[PDB]
Structure formats: C-alpha cells, structure tokens
Amino acid sequence: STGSATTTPIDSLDDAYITPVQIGTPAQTLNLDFDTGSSDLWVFSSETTASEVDGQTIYTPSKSTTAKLLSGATWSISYGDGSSSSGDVYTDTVSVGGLTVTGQAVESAKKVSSSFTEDSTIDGLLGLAFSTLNTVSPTQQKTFFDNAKASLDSPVFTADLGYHAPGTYNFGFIDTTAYTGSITYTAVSTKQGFWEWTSTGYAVGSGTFKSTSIDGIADTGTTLLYLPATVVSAYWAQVSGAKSSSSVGGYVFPCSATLPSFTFGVGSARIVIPGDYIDFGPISTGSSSCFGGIQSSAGIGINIFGDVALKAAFVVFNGATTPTLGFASK
C-alpha cells in the first residue's frame, strides 16, 4: 500500500504545516501537524477542556463506530518549545492520503497548553519519530508509520515541504519526479528516538564550505533551523545590522536586508537554503526588525534541522531495519 497527502502552511510565514487526516467511522477529518520529532498522535477532542478549545476541529469518539477506549491508558507530553498536552486514549481507524491503519492509538486531549489553544489551525499532532518516544502509559503505543510499515510497498515516508506553498507527505514510495539529481543517504542514530544524523558541514552565501560534523535531528515539527552558536554567528555576521537579542529571543535583522543563502552538507552532497527561507518577518506588527530563521541551539541540547532546512529538500525517512535519511535538491 501507499498514501499521499498534501501538507499546507498554516500561515504566511510557514510557521507549521497541516495535513488532513481521517479518523473514525464515518470519517472525521482533522488537520494535524506531522512531527518527525515526536511519536504521539494526539487530537483536540470532545474531551478537551472547553475553555482550551478555540476554533479547532475536534474528534468525537462517541460518534465513531470503530472507536474503542484503550482502558487505563493515559498520555502526557511536553515539547521543546514548552508547550504540552495530555489525556486518555482510544484506538480507531486512521487514514492519511488513502493509506489506512486500523487499531491506531488516537490520544484524546483532556488538556492542552495555551500555545495549542491559540492556534486554531492545528487540530493535533501526528508523530513520526520512533515509537520508543511514545508517551502512552502503562502500555506504550506505536506511531502511524510504525503500524503502517509492514503493509507499505517500501518502509519509507517522504517529506516535501513547500516554501510559502503546499507540499506533500508520501508513505510507502519515493516519487522520483519530485526531486532533481540524486538522493544522498546518510546514517541515522535512533538512540534518542529521533531521526538523528550528522551533517558534513556548511557554507554561508557564496562562501567556502566548512567541513565539520554537525549532529542533529530532522524535525518537521520545528519551524526553524537550530545550529551551534559558532555556525549561527558566522551566518548572521554576513548580514549588516543583525544581532542577537535576548529580549526578542534570538537573532534579529533589519527588514531591509537581503539575506544570504545557507548550505548544509549531506555526505558529499549540498543542500542550499535560499536567503528568503530564513526571513520570518517583523518581530511585531509594523516593526522594521525581522526575526531570523537560523538560530542558536545552545541550551536546547540538540541541533535541529527544522522546516527552514527541510523545505529546501526532498527528504526520505527510510524506516528499514537499519534506518537512514535521504536528501535531494528539488
């Protein structure tokens, strides 16, 4: 089997991407944030504290003939950005782009943090990291991909995120028309439960490539590119007037600037992030200070190849017995 679904930016900045997901019988379609940095499929639901729902579409398990309470199971998750959610668990039929999993754990939120409430466009998350990170207790549950894997034509999914435009998540096949040149594959460590890999270096604009190992995670659920302070300083030093602002929470730059590109290495291959991808616009409405899309990972504890990086590539998440990651230009 295979599946193919379009993923759409939630706003004009590509702050996140939503993908429609069918849950239950008859189908209830919710728009979920596909997150290769976590491993819970959770949704706003009829059980979510009413004051914490503000415009989201909810899953109502009582209206699904295939929903079953997973007795005794609870979940609770905290994300890198400080947001969180928790609740209980149902199993139900879940379909993405024509690919169907029966008995998928659907984690129903009883509580969500303010960031989730305030984002009316995201109805929940669909985790695509390794199932070892799943938070369901006392019986850990599998991700949608893990459940689908044996049925897929090939045990892979691909992320093809757009810049200010829709893109695609495919399951079970590699669309050879969706990228240019060849796909370069690179080793993955699953030791921390993430799609963790090592970039071979970077360049800023038309500058020389610096060969240096940068361990980080491929994370579709993180907006920006978070890299070591040395790398980030070298980038922003090429932008007149750019500075790190503790008050704003990172590097800012004059909105009048033309940003240089940023290249990262995948083995001997190179992925070029155009400068425009690094512009996250005014820090507040009407400001002439703009927020940078490349930020320091210092104090995160891990480097994160988030959407800024991933949307410059066609990315293969290869879930073979020994997982690997593939990157192609597009």
Q: Which residue has the tokens 């209830």?
A: 28
Please answer whether residues 48 and 109 qualify as being in contact, where contact means their C-beta atoms are separated by less than 8 angstroms: yes
Q: Which residues pair with 156 in a beta bridge?
A: 318
Name the amino acid, one letter, at 154: S
Yes or no: say if 45 and 59 are a contact pair by the CB < 8 Å rule. yes
Q: Given in angstroms, what resolution was this structure solved at?
A: 1.3
Rounded CA-CA distance 211/91 in Å is: 47
Give φ, ψ of 270 to 5 degrees. -135, 135
Q: Which residues, at least 6 apart from 205, have a Cβ–Cβ distance to it below 8 Å?
A: 238, 260, 261, 262, 275
Encode the chain in three state secondary structure. CCEEEEEEECCCCCCCEEEEEEECCCCEEEEEEEECCCCCEEECECCCCHHHCCCCCCECHHHCCCCEEEEEEEEEEECCCCCEEEEEEEEEEEEECCEEEEEEEEEEEEEECHHHHCCCCCCEEEECCCHHHCCCECCCCCCHHHHHHHHCCCCEEEEECCCCCCEEEEECCCCCCCCCCCCEEEECECCCCCCEEEEEEEEECCCCCEEEEEEEEECCCCCCEEECHHHHHHHHCCCCCCEEECCCCEEEEECCCCCCCEEEEECCEEEEECHHHHEEEECCCCCCEEEECEEECCCCCCEEECHHHHCCCEEEEECCCCCEEEEECC
List the catalytic residue out of 38, 64, 131, 199.
199
Residue with tokens 């604009």: 205
Give catalytic status of residue 35 as yes or no.
yes
- Catalytic residue flag (residue 199): yes
CA 277 to chain centre: 16
Active-site hit among 35, 119, 160, 219: 35
What's the residue count for the chain?
Answer: 330
Residue 299, CB-side half-sphere exposure with 13 Å CA sphere = 6
Extract the tokens encoding 105: 């754990």
Residue with tokens 């979920």: 32
Give the residue among 306, 324, 291 at the shortest CA–CA distance from 227.
306
- Output the furthest CA–CA distance in the chain (Å, rounded): 60
Distances (CA, A) of 251 to 39, 131, 247: 30, 34, 10
Give how far Cα 29 sits from Cα of 58, 76, 128, 172, 303, Å. 9, 23, 19, 22, 33
Q: By CB neighbour count within 10 A (0-12 exposed, 13-18 middle, 19+ buried), where does 171 fall?
A: buried
The span from the CA of 170 to the CA of 156, in Å, is 8
Q: How many CB atoms lie within 10 A of CB 193?
A: 17
What radius of gyration do the chain's Cα atoms show?
20
CA-to-CA distance for 147 and 126, rounded, in angstroms?
13
d(CA 222, CA 266): 20
Residue carrying the six token digits 């989201």: 56
Domains within the chain, CATH numbers bracketed: 5-174 (2.40.70.10), 175-330 (2.40.70.10)
